[PDB]
Amino acid sequence: KLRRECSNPTCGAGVFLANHKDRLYCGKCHSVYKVNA
RNA sequence: GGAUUGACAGAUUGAGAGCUCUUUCUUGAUUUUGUGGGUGGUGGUGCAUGGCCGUUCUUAGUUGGUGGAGUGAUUUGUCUG
Numbered sequence: 001k002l003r004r005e006c007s008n009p010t011c012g013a014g015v016f017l018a019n020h021k022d023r024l025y026c027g028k029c030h031s032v033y034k035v036n037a
Numbered sequence: 038g039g040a041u042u043g044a045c046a047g048a049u050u051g052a053g054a055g056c057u058c059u060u061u062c063u064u065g066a067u068u069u070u071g072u073g074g075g076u077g078g079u080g081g082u083g084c085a086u087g088g089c090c091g092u093u094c095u096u097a098g099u100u101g102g103u104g105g106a107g108u109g110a111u112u113u114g115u116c117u118g
């Protein structure tokens with residue numbers, strides 16, 4: 001189980017997340033969502 | 038098991054440029070590219086045009102209808118004062 005959830009304002013907890021090592025970050029929250037959940 | 042944008046911060050780069058990376062998701066086919074066509078084009082010729090303007094040019098000039106002169110190009114009318 002990998003690649004956990006965002007705080008995406010568009011839909012409530014409903015995306016997978018494009019993440020490097022040691023972070024957690026959405027694929028459309030490109031200008032927002034600094035803290036990795 | 039996404040044609041492709043773009044992804045915090047760290048050397049960048051006008052900065053939150055994923056421009057390039059240290060690298061993985063979404064609205065989902067509307068285009069990564071294979072011809073053939075305008076293209077942004079102000080880099081294209083006003084020597085192919087319009088339209089406009091300037092000029093010839095604050096000067097007095099121009100033409101056709103009848104008839105005359107000349108075979109005719111053309112003159113006359115449009116003039117000596």
Ligand SMILES: [Zn+2]
Pocket residue numbers: 008010011014015028
């Ligand atoms: Zn979403």
